[PDB]
Amino acid sequence: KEWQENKSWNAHFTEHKSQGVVVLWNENKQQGFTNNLKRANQAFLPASTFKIPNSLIALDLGVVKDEHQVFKWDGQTRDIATWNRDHNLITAMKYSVVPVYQEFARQIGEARMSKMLHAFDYGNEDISGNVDSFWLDGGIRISATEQISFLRKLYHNKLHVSERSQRIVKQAMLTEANGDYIIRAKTGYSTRIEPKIGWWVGWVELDDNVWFFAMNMDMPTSDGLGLRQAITKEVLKQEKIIP
């Protein structure tokens, strides 16, 4: 789908002692750009970026009624403090609350989960593993360019779910908005299976164009997680997509 490699983006990885790939897609021009054509097509566990298709399926099936429905904390104190409270869809996305989404997956069930991922053509369409963790330590794999293809369908309401489900998930993906741009996006952190990597996928809305992006990077410890957004935003600024 015509692709250009820009190795100069590696400066932002090197200056932060990191390795990874950033993939950009110019929607108006139907042109992609990446610092690493090979890693752009390498498929990894999605980790919490799977909250995007999981939210879509839970909404379309009515497992989740709307973005205000409250999911009560199950009482177990977990390591991440923001998880130990009640949540709705907006806040569960914001704080990447895995237990809420594992509950969704159990209710969806393997049969409907598999049919939906085949309908979405999501990654390798493989949900081998535990129904409540296959996106963390099971068989599903998705590349950065495959994230882009999925996200473009979601942006255009072209996925095989209701228009309403897609609108709600795109609301819950809202990450940043100002007078220059809007970012809708989701992070992920894959630690259970090598290689440990961090994800950021989503898009930048401008007045007259949309730039889709998907990045992943090596993440040996959780102390580099903020580099997912930092390095992406530095690539977007280098390309004059955002000020």
Next chain:
Amino acid sequence: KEWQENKSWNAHFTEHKSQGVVVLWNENKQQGFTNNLKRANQAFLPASTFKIPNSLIALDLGVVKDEHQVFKWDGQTRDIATWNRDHNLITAMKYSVVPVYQEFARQIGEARMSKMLHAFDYGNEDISGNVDSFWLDGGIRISATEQISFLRKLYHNKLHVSERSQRIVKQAMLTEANGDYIIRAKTGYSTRIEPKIGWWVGWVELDDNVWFFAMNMDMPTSDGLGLRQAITKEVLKQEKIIP
């Protein structure tokens, strides 16, 4: 419904050599707050804050198909340069493009416009004047507290239009988003009939509450337009609603 006057907010107006009102509504507690109970109930022309009901009606009637439909420039060079180009619903809201919305109102028509504003309980529901300018120089009036009453219905999808129309307009109202809050809002600047006033109405979404707001202020010249948001934010910061 339990109102409290806080005259210490007047300092933010006087600091800026200005006069006006800010009205806040705590949705969880169902309590309102204002620096001026009398001006909070004073009805003014809505000017471009009327883009919120106008968008809702145009979408519900199919005058606007979706937020991507392009409204071509009519080739009239107007004083605000950002108006002299093609727009969609998102950019027409962002740049407050009056002529796009005047065309909406002509296509809606007098009969359907009057019926819909009655259905919304919007202000005084009076559309006396030109069908394509009554919110700028006709008979419609709305107070800051009435703006909040209307906005609360929109937030809850309770207005008598489709859920889809309400979701699209709330998307188009997106003004600011970060890791702490989301602001959905619309500015207005009424100059055709005295007194000249500026508006800012909308809400702040937090993790666990929603704060609705409506402000207007005297605006003799366009030089103070930035004070509409700046003074509201100074009040929100004083009240610890935003960091």
